[PDB]
Amino acid sequence: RSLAAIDSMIDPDISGPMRHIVVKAIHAAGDFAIAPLIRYSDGFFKSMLAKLKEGCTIICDSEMVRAGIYSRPVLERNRVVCYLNDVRSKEMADVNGITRSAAGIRIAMQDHRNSVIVIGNAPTALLEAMRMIEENGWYDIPIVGIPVGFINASKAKEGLVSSHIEYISVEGHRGGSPIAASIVNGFGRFL
Amino acid sequence: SLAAIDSMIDPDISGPMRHIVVKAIHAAGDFAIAPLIRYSDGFFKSMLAKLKEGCTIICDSEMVRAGIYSRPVLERNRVVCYLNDVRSKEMADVNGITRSAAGIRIAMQDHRNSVIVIGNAPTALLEAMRMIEENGWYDIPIVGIPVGFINASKAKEGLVSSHIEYISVEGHRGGSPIAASIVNGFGRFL
Amino acid sequence: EERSLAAIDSMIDPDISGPMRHIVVKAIHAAGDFAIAPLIRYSDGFFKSMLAKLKEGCTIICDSEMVRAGIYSRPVLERNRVVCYLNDVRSKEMADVNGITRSAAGIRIAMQDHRNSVIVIGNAPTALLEAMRMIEENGWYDIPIVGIPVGFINASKAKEGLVSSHIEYISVEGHRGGSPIAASIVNGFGRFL
Amino acid sequence: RSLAAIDSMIDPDISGPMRHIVVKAIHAAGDFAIAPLIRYSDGFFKSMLAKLKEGCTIICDSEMVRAGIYSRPVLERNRVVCYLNDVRSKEMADVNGITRSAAGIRIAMQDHRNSVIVIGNAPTALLEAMRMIEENGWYDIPIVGIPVGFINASKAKEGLVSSHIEYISVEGHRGGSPIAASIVNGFGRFL
Numbered sequence: 001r002s003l004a005a006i007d008s009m010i011d012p013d014i015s016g017p018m019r020h021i022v023v024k025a026i027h028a029a030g031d032f033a034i035a036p037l038i039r040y041s042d043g044f045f046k047s048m049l050a051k052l053k054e055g056c057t058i059i060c061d062s063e064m065v066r067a068g069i070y071s072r073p074v075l076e077r078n079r080v081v082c083y084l085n086d087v088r089s090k091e092m093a094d095v096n097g098i099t100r101s102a103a104g105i106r107i108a109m110q111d112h113r114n115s116v117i118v119i120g121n122a123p124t125a126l127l128e129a130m131r132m133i134e135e136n137g138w139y140d141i142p143i144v145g146i147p148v149g150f151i152n153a154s155k156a157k158e159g160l161v162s163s164h165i166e167y168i169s170v171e172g173h174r175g176g177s178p179i180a181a182s183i184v185n186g187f188g189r190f191l
Numbered sequence: 192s193l194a195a196i197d198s199m200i201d202p203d204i205s206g207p208m209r210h211i212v213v214k215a216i217h218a219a220g221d222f223a224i225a226p227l228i229r230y231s232d233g234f235f236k237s238m239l240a241k242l243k244e245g246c247t248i249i250c251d252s253e254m255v256r257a258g259i260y261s262r263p264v265l266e267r268n269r270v271v272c273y274l275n276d277v278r279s280k281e282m283a284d285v286n287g288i289t290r291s292a293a294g295i296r297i298a299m300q301d302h303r304n305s306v307i308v309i310g311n312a313p314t315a316l317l318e319a320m321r322m323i324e325e326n327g328w329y330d331i332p333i334v335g336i337p338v339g340f341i342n343a344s345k346a347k348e349g350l351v352s353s354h355i356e357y358i359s360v361e362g363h364r365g366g367s368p369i370a371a372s373i374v375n376g377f378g379r380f381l
Numbered sequence: 382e383e384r385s386l387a388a389i390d391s392m393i394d395p396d397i398s399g400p401m402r403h404i405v406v407k408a409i410h411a412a413g414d415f416a417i418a419p420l421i422r423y424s425d426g427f428f429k430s431m432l433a434k435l436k437e438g439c440t441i442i443c444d445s446e447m448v449r450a451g452i453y454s455r456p457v458l459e460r461n462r463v464v465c466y467l468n469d470v471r472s473k474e475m476a477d478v479n480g481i482t483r484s485a486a487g488i489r490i491a492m493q494d495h496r497n498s499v500i501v502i503g504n505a506p507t508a509l510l511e512a513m514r515m516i517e518e519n520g521w522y523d524i525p526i527v528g529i530p531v532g533f534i535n536a537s538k539a540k541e542g543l544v545s546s547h548i549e550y551i552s553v554e555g556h557r558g559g560s561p562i563a564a565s566i567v568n569g570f571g572r573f574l
Numbered sequence: 575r576s577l578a579a580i581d582s583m584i585d586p587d588i589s590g591p592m593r594h595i596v597v598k599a600i601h602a603a604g605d606f607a608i609a610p611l612i613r614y615s616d617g618f619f620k621s622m623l624a625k626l627k628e629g630c631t632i633i634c635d636s637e638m639v640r641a642g643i644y645s646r647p648v649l650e651r652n653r654v655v656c657y658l659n660d661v662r663s664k665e666m667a668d669v670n671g672i673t674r675s676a677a678g679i680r681i682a683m684q685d686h687r688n689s690v691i692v693i694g695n696a697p698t699a700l701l702e703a704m705r706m707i708e709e710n711g712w713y714d715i716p717i718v719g720i721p722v723g724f725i726n727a728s729k730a731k732e733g734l735v736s737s738h739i740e741y742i743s744v745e746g747h748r749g750g751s752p753i754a755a756s757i758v759n760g761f762g763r764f765l
Binding site: 532534535561 | 576637
Binding site: 192194199221223 | 607
C-alpha cells in the first residue's frame with residue numbers, strides 16, 4: 001500500500017525505530033517531501049525512549065498537540081499536559097511580555113521537571129523550551145520541535161539544530177500538531 | 192506574511208469565503224494548498240445556516256475538536272467526537288470498518304442536525320458521505336480535509352464530485368489545523 | 382527505473398488504467414515528487430487524440446527550448462518534428478503590436494505555420510492561454526494540449542480554464558509544472574508507437 | 575506581486591545579489607517550499623560571478639539544462655556544453671563502470687579544466703563532479719548541484735553541502751533543470 005511504499009523511499013541510513021517514527025511523521029503530514037527534511041540529534045531516540053519508558057510528563061504547546069497523543073502504550077505511564085489556559089500562564093504572559101504559549105511552557109516545566117517537550121505550533125514556545133533547558137542545564141529533556149510559521153518558524157528551528165539539546169525537527173516551513181503528535185505516538189511501539 | 196497569502200489567492204475568490212481561504216492557508220503554513228482549495232457554490236450558505244441556527248459539529252478526531260475554539264461558534268454549537276466512545280470500538284469490530292468511520296456513524300445517528308468536519312481519516316470522510324447519500328441528508332455540509340495518500344486523494348475526489356455541499360483540499364495535503372481553522376473562520380459571520 | 386516505479390505506482394489511483402498509467406508514472410518520475418500524482422488531470426479523449434497525432438506524424442509546438450530539448454523518444458522524433466518559435470523575429474514585432482508576450486506570439490506564429498499540431502506548454506501561462514484561444518476561435522479541437530505551465534496565481538488560473546474547456550489535454554492542478562514534466566509526457570507516447 | 579510574495583519567504587539574512595538569484599530559482603520552480611531549503615556556500619556568489627564574467631565553460635549534465643541557459647550576457651562570454659552524447663562517454667562509462675551522465679561530466683571536465691558545473695538532473699553526475707574535484711584538488715570549480723530524484727538526489731546534495739566545494743543546492747528531493755538553469759541565468763544581470 002501507500003505507507004508500505006514510503007518505508008522504502010526513506011534515507012537508508014535512518015535505521016530501525018526512527019524509520020518507523022519518520023514514516024508516522026510522513027503519514028501525519030501526507031507529504032513525502034518532509035522525509036529527507038527531518039533532522040534529529042544522535043541521542044534523540046534514546047533520550048526520548050528513556051523518558052517515555054520510565055514515565056514522565058509530556059508538555060505540549062497546544063491543545064491540538066495534547067489531544068493528538070493517544071497511543072495507549074504512551075498514555076500508560078505518561079501524562080500529557082497543556083498549560084495554555086493556566087491562570088499563572090496568562091498572568092505571566094501579560095506581565096513578562098511573552099506569548100501565552102511561551103508562558104504555558106515555562107509554567108509547565110516548573111511544575112513538572114521530568115518532562116518531554118512537544119512543539120507543534122508556536123515558534124515562541126519552542127524558543128522558550130530551549131531557553132528553559134539551557135539556562136537550567138536540563139539536557140535530559142528532549143524536544144519534538146515542529147512549530148508552524150515561515151521565517152519565524154525556520155529561525156527558531158535553526159537554533160534547535162545547533163544547541164546541546166536532544167531533538168527532532170523538520171527543515172523548512174512544514175510543521176504542525178499532526179506531525180508533532182504522530183512522532184510521540186510512534187514511540188508507543190517501543191514501550 | 193498575511194499580505195503574501197492574500198495575493199496568492201485568485202482575485203476572483205471574493206466574499207466571506209476569501210476570509211475562510213486565508214485562514215486555511217495560514218493554518219496550513221503553506222501557500223501550495225492555495226490553488227488546491229475547493230468548495231461548492233452552496234457551501235458558505237449551507238455552513239452559516241447550520242452554525243447560526245446552532246447544530247452539532249461532528250469531528251472525526253479529538254485534534255479537530257480541540258482546534259475549534261471560536262467563541263461565536265461554540266456559543267451556539269456543540270462540538271463532538273465519538274472516536275473514543277465505547278460504542279465505536281464495538282461497531283467498528285462487528286462491521287469491520289475503522290474506528291473513525293464508526294465514530295462518524297454513531298455521531299450522526301445520535302445527532303441528525305449536523306456539520307461534518309474531517310481532519311484526519313479518509314474512511315471517516317467516506318462514511319460521512321455514505322450516511323448522507325444513503326439517507327438523503329443533503330442539508331449537511333462537509334469540511335472534508337482528510338490527510339493521507341491514495342486513500343485521502345480518492346475520498347476527497349469523490350467529495351468534490353458528489354452533490355454534497357463541501358470544502359476540501361485536492362491532493363494528499365489536509366489535516367486538523369486546516370479543518371479546524373475553516374470552522375473557526377465562520378465565527379466572524381455568526 | 383527502480384523500486385521508485387513501484388513506489389510511484391502505489392501513489393497513482395488505480396482508476397488510471399490503460400496506456401495513460403504509464404504516461405502518468407513517467408510524469409511523476411520526471412517531477413521527482415509524489416505530490417503531483419493526485420494533481421494530474423487529463424480529458425478522456427487525451428490519449429487517443431495524442432496517439433493519433435504522433436502516430437500519423439505532426440508538428441509538436443513547444444513554448445520553450447527546454448521542452449524541445451527534453452523530447453528524445455526515437456519513435457516520436459522519427460515521425461514528428463518538434464519546434465519552438467520563441468525566437469522567430471516575427472515574435473517580438475507581433476508581441477509589441479498585439480500587446481502579448483513573446484511566448485504567446487511564438488505559439489500563434491507556430492500554429493499558423495503548422496496547423497496539424499500538438500501543443501506542449503512547460504513554462505509560460507500566456508503560451509497556454511494563446512494556444513487555447515487559437516483552438517477555440519478556429520475550432521481546431523483535434524489539437525491536444527499538454528498544458529504544464531509553471532507559476533503561481535497566473536499558472537493556476539490558466540490551467541483551470543484548460544480543464545474546463547472542450548480541448549483534449551493533460552495538466553497538473555495548482556502551482557506545479559515545468560518542462561521536465563511536459564517533455565516526459567510526450568516521451569511516454571513513444572512506447573506506444 | 576508574486577515577487578513580493580516570494581521575497582517575503584526569503585530569510586532576511588540572504589542579502590546582496592544572491593537574494594535576486596534565490597528569488598529567480600523559487601519562481602522557476604513555482605514552489606515556495608524550497609525558499610527555506612536553498613543552501614549555498616559563503617564564496618559561491620563571488621566564485622560563480624567571476625567565472626561567468628571572465629568567460630569559462632559551463633558543463634551541464636543534461637540537454638534540458640543546457641537549453642535552459644539563455645541569458646545573453648552569459649552566452650556572450652561563456653560556452654555551455656553537455657557531453658552526454660559524446661562518443662568517449664559510453665566508452666569511458668564501460669571501462670570505468672559509471673553511468674553516462676557521470677562519464678559525460680568526467681570527459682567534459684578533462685577537456686575543460688576552467689569550468690562551472692551545473693547539475694539539473696542526475697545524482698551520479700553531481701557525485702562524479704565532486705569526485706573529480708576532490709581527487710584533483712580543483713576547488714576553484716563551483717557547483718550548481720540541483721539533481722532530482724527521491725533517494726539518491728537528497729543524499730548526493732547532502733554531501734555537497736558538507737564538502738569544501740563552493741556550491742548552491744536545494745535540500746530534499748526537489749531539484750531539476752528549470753531551477754538549475756534559472757540560477758545560472760540569474761547571474762546575467764551582474765555581468
